Amino acid sequence: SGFRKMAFPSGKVEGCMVQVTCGTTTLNGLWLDDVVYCPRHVICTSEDMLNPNYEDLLIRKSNHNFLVQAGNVQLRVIGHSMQNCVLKLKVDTANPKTPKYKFVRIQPGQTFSVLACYNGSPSGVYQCAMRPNFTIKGSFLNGSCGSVGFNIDYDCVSFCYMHHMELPTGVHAGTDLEGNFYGPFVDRQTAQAAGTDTTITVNVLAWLYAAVINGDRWFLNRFTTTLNDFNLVAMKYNYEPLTQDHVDILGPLSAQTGIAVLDMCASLKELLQNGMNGRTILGSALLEDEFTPFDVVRQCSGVTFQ
Amino acid sequence: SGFRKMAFPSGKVEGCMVQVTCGTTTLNGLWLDDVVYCPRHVICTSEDMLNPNYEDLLIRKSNHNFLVQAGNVQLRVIGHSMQNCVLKLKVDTANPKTPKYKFVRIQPGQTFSVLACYNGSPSGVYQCAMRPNFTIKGSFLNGSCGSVGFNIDYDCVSFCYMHHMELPTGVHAGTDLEGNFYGPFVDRQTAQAAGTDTTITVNVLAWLYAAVINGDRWFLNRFTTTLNDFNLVAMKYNYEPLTQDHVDILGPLSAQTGIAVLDMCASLKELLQNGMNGRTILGSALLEDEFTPFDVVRQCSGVTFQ
Numbered sequence: 001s002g003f004r005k006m007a008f009p010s011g012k013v014e015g016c017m018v019q020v021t022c023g024t025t026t027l028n029g030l031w032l033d034d035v036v037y038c039p040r041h042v043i044c045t046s047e048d049m050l051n052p053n054y055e056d057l058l059i060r061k062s063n064h065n066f067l068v069q070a071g072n073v074q075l076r077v078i079g080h081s082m083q084n085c086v087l088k089l090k091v092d093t094a095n096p097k098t099p100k101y102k103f104v105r106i107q108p109g110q111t112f113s114v115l116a117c118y119n120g121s122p123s124g125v126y127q128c129a130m131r132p133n134f135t136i137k138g139s140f141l142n143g144s145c146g147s148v149g150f151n152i153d154y155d156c157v158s159f160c161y162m163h164h165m166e167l168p169t170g171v172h173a174g175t176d177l178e179g180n181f182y183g184p185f186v187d188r189q190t191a192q193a194a195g196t197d198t199t200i201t202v203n204v205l206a207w208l209y210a211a212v213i214n215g216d217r218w219f220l221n222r223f224t225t226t227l228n229d230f231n232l233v234a235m236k237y238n239y240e241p242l243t244q245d246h247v248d249i250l251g252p253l254s255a256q257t258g259i260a261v262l263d264m265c266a267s268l269k270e271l272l273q274n275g276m277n278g279r280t281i282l283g284s285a286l287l288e289d290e291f292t293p294f295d296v297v298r299q300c301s302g303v304t305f306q
Numbered sequence: 307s308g309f310r311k312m313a314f315p316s317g318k319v320e321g322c323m324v325q326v327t328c329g330t331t332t333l334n335g336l337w338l339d340d341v342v343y344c345p346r347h348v349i350c351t352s353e354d355m356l357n358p359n360y361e362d363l364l365i366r367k368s369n370h371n372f373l374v375q376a377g378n379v380q381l382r383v384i385g386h387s388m389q390n391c392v393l394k395l396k397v398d399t400a401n402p403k404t405p406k407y408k409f410v411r412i413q414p415g416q417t418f419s420v421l422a423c424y425n426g427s428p429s430g431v432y433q434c435a436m437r438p439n440f441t442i443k444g445s446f447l448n449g450s451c452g453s454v455g456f457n458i459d460y461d462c463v464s465f466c467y468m469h470h471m472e473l474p475t476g477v478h479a480g481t482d483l484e485g486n487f488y489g490p491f492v493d494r495q496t497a498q499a500a501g502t503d504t505t506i507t508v509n510v511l512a513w514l515y516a517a518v519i520n521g522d523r524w525f526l527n528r529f530t531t532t533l534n535d536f537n538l539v540a541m542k543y544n545y546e547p548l549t550q551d552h553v554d555i556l557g558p559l560s561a562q563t564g565i566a567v568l569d570m571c572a573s574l575k576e577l578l579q580n581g582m583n584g585r586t587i588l589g590s591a592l593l594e595d596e597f598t599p600f601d602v603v604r605q606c607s608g609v610t611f612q
C-alpha cells in the first residue's frame with residue numbers, strides 16, 4: 001500500500017515558532033511556556049563567527065536587546081541566560097499554544113522531523129536522521145538557524161534538535177534543546193569537517209522488511225549468514241556494525257514477515273557485493289537508511305497522533 | 307545548502323480533519339466552514355464495492371445516519387448532498403479553525419502535500435505528484451480514505467486532492483474537492499489499471515538545476531540539443547515530451563545558474579543513454595521528477611508561509 005518518507009504533522013510545533021532579532025542578526029526561536037529557546041550565535045555578527053567569545057559578547061546584552069516577535073506581537077523579555085550553546089529568553093507570557101512536550105537527546109541512527117523556518121515563519125517539513133558522524137542531511141539556508149527537529153508520540157512532542165550551522169561540505173550540525181552539540185561540532189566558523197558517513201545498517205534492514213510488506217521481494221535471496229560474517233562485509237562498505245540489540249529490535253518485523261533477521265542480512269550482503277543491477281526497491285536505486293524499525297511499524301500499521 | 311523532499315507545514319489542515327462514520331464504515335472528512343467533505347463510498351459496505359449504485363444506497367440515509375466526531379465532540383448534521391464522488395455534510399457549526407482556502411484542480415506534473423489521517427487523526431505528511439497517468443504514489447492503508455492533498459501560498463490553503471482508492475498495483479487514486487476523479491478511475495472495486503507511468507521531464511530538469519545550485523555538477527556535459535532531437539530520446543525512455551512552455555517555466559532557473567535550458571536537456575539526454583555509472587545526484591541514483599520548477603525556486607530561496 002506504498003511506503004514514503006513521512007514526517008510528523010507539524011501544527012503543534014508551528015505554534016511555537018517566533019522571530020528573534022539581536023543587533024543585526026535575526027533567526028528563529030522556540031517558545032514553550034514562558035521561555036524562548038534559540039541559538040546563542042544570535043548575538044554574533046558575521047565578523048564575530050571566526051572566533052567568538054560568547055561570555056564576553058553577552059556582557060553588552062540586556063533583556064531589551066533581544067527583540068522577539070510572534071506573528072506581529074512583541075513579547076517582553078524579563079530575563080535571559082546562556083545554557084551551553086543555546087540562549088533561554090524568559091518572557092512575561094506563556095505561549096497559549098504550548099504542547100505537551102519534553103526534551104530528548106537522540107542516538108545516532110534515530111529519526112525525526114525538521115520544520116524549516118525563516119524569520120519565525122514555517123517554510124516546510126521533512127524527515128531526517130542523526131547520522132553516525134553526527135551530522136544531518138537537511139535543507140537549510142541563511143536565517144534557518146533555530147529551526148527544530150522533533151518526534152511526536154500521541155499528544156506529546158519530543159524535541160531533539162536545534163539547527164545551528166552548515167559545514168563547508170553542505171551537511172548540517174546543531175544541538176539538543178539543552179544546547180549541547182551533537183558530535184564534535186562548535187558554533188564557530190572554522191575548520192571542522194565531518195567524519196565517515198557510514199550507513200545505518202539496522203535501518204536498511206528495517207526498510208527491506210518494509211519493501212517485503214509492500215510487494216518488492218526480488219532481493220529475497222536463498223542464503224542466511226551470521227552476525228560476524230555479515231559484519232566483515234559491512235565493514236568494507238562503511239556500514240555500521242550490526243549488534244544483537246539491533247537483531248532484537250527487528251524481531252517484530254521478522255515475525256510479521258516470517259523472514260529471519262539473519263536471512264535478511266544475507267540478502268543485504270548480496271546487494272552490497274553484486275549491486276542492484278538497475279532494479280529498484282520501493283522506488284529507490286540506492287539502499288535507504290533513514291527509516292527506523294519503529295518508523296516502519298508505525299507507517300505499515302497506521303499509528304495516529306493528536 | 308541541501309535539497310530535500312519537503313512538504314508544507316500541516317497545522318492548518320490538521321484542524322480541519324474529522325472522523326465520519328456511516329453504518330460500519332469509518333473514514334476521514336474535511337471540515338471547512340459549516341461543511342464536511344468526505345468520499346461518498348463512506349456509505350458502502352465491503353460487499354457494496356464491486357458494483358455500488360450510489361444514488362440508491364443514499365436513499366436509505368438521513369442526516370442522522372452520518373456520525374461526525376471532532377476530537378471528542380459530535381457535530382450535528384443538518385443536511386447532506388452528493389456532488390460527483392464526494393458527500394458534502396452540512397453541519398450546524400462552522401469550524402472555528404477554518405483557514406483561508408480554495409479548491410483547485412491541479413494538472414499532471416504538479417506537486418502537493420498529503421496529510422495521511424486515520425479515524426480523523428493525523429498520522430504524517432509527505433509530498434506527492436499527480437502522475438501523468440493520473441495516479442499518485444502515496445502511503446495509504448485501510449481507513450486513510452478522505453485524507454487530502456494541498457498546497458499553501460502564504461496564508462491561503464489550496465486543496466487539490468482527496469484520497470479514495472488503492473489499485474491492485476498499489477498506487478493510489480482520488481478526486482479534486484468537487485468530487486471528480488483525477489484520470490479515468492471510479493469508486494468501484496473492479497478491473498481498472500494504471501497506464502504508462504511516464505516521467506515528468508520538466509521536473510527532472512528543475513531538479514538538475516537544483517543540483518547545480520547545491521554543488522552536484524559532474525553531469526554538466528558539453529553539448530546542447532534541440533527540443534525535437536531531445537524529445538526523440540525522451541520518447542523511448544517514456545519521458546513526457548518537453549514543450550516551449552516548459553522551457554519558458556525554467557527560464558528563471560536558467561538565469562540563476564547561467565545554464566541554458568537546451569544545454570541542460572543535452573546533459574539529461576546523456577544521462578538517459580549512458581546511465582549514472584554508479585554516481586549520485588542530490589543523494590539519488592535515479593532521476594527525480596516530483597519537484598516542480600516552483601518547488602525548486604521556493605526551497606532554494608526560502609519562501610515562508612503563515
Ligand SMILES: *SC[C@@H](NC(=O)CC[C@H](N)C(=O)O)C(=O)NCC(=O)OC(C)C
Pocket residue numbers: 099100101102103153155156157158
Ligand atoms: S510529552 C508528555 C509527558 N512527558 C513524559 O512524561 C514523557 C514520557 C512519554 N513520552 C509520555 O508519557 O508521553 C508530559 O506530561 N509532559 C508535560 C510537559 O510539558 O513537560 C515539560 C517537561 C514541561
Ligand SMILES: *SC[C@@H](NC(=O)CC[C@H](N)C(=O)O)C(=O)NCC(=O)OC(C)C
Pocket residue numbers: 405406407408409459461462463464
Ligand atoms: S485562499 C485565499 C483567497 N483565495 C483566492 O482569492 C485565491 C488566489 C490567491 N491564492 C490568493 O489571493 O491567495 C481567499 O480569500 N479565500 C477565502 C476563502 O476561504 O475562500 C473560500 C472559497 C470560501
